[PDB]
Design a protein around this ligand. Sequence first.
Ligand SMILES: [Zn+2]
Ligand SMILES: [Zn+2]
Ligand SMILES: [Zn+2]
Lengths: 49, 65, 44, 114, 266
Amino acid sequence: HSKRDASTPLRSTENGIVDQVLVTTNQDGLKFVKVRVRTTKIPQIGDKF
Amino acid sequence: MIVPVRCFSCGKVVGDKWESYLNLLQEDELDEGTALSRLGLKRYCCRRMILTHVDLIEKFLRYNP
Amino acid sequence: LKYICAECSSKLSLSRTDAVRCKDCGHRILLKARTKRLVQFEAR
Amino acid sequence: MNAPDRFELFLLGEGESKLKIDPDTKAPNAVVITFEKEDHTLGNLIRAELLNDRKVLFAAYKVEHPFFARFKLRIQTTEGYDPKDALKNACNSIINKLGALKTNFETEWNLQTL
Amino acid sequence: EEGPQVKIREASKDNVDFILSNVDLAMANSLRRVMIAEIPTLAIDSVEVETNTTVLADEFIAHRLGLIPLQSMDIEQLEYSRDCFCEDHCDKCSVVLTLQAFGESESTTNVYSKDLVIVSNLMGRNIGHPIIQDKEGNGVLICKLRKGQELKLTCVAKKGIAKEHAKWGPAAAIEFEYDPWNKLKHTDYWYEQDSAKEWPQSKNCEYEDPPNEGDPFDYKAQADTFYMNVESVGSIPVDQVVVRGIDTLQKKVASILLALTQMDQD
Ligand SMILES: [Zn+2]
Ligand SMILES: [Zn+2]
Ligand SMILES: [Zn+2]
């Protein structure tokens, strides 16, 4: 056990489909990532209008 | 976005009438009312469905990705 | 695995220990390619 | 999220029977029948056809909650007349009327143009 | 015949304007409800997307495909996937049609409903073919591709009821009106001065006799004459819309009758 986990979990209450993943180095030369997840929401009982 | 396929209210198909509508506006030089009338959109819900729509996909296609 | 650049129509396959930048471009914005395992859609 | 399946509106669940006939305890010679996976379309028609039978004292349907596709139908007939027979007669009458209506609509359709 | 009477005032490929005579209100209403919802129809239920580089989202396009009107003529000799003894779907229950589109010209490459190509085996049955009432023969505008954009997907269409989803709706708007002169007094008209001058006069008023002010209110009168106009979408012909409506109502009554027959088991 030489590694600690620093993984990022999907929102506990949300769900959907991974829309698009972006991998890019930072200004300080740090490999960072932005993951966009897409979910279609349909008007339900309780939605505000 | 893009022209809705069918009318929300009643359910009449309108997605096949968008380009025809545009042509009736630019080619035959009619007003929106008559153009909507000729396409068989008598009920004001479908009439709304086409008249109220904004075709945003044409602006979306301007990007290269 | 493989990736695809943002502001050009390329198809990089550089895995780890590579990353940025891009083949014949210069920009460091890399997107990931679509999965092969297809996903269904309840057309409703 | 908590929204029920759509097919639960017309597909009978696990163990759910179509009709639930129960002896009414209020008035004598009465009955309450629970219709599953059916809405106003059937209830209104059946109830309206049970008021044509002059040997039927009471006939009323209701949907206790719009969430669930089901309705209760209360029928009270005269003595010496089982209410199930009233329901059957009503149903058969409906079927006959609909058959005649279909035939008439077909014959009237064949005589058209465009 | 002997029961209710029909009088087709107008008839076309898309609409049927007729008059129901000698009928109870509940039967007319229920007929309308059945025609609106409970009528079998074929429509895209499943969409498998391979590649999608278009602007629109995946389930967006999928949703648009769901609303595409398909040929549901011989739908009665097609079967529900929930009833078929196969795995997922087959040729006895579902109709599979592919869609491959790609930006070719510098101009915008439109993707219509005509581009859908039937892959599954129809084996004789008239089914699956996308209705095209378009004048140019294109049909429903599905999407728009740029220059190098591609849309590769497959569509499994299954038999469904409009009660489950409005995409399986065989009819559009059903016009319905009884007693144009309010002789039954089912409606208390709202007004500011004159009740008759403010409220427009219905067309159906040309098919009934106006009330006499010297005559009192007819309290023993019911509703017999009904003016209807059934409009189809294309999936099912109008005559078959109302006819299969009748058959469906009658059938689901016969199911209740059968249930009563079966409840006699000890
Ligand atoms: Zn409409
Ligand atoms: Zn590049
Ligand atoms: Zn099958």
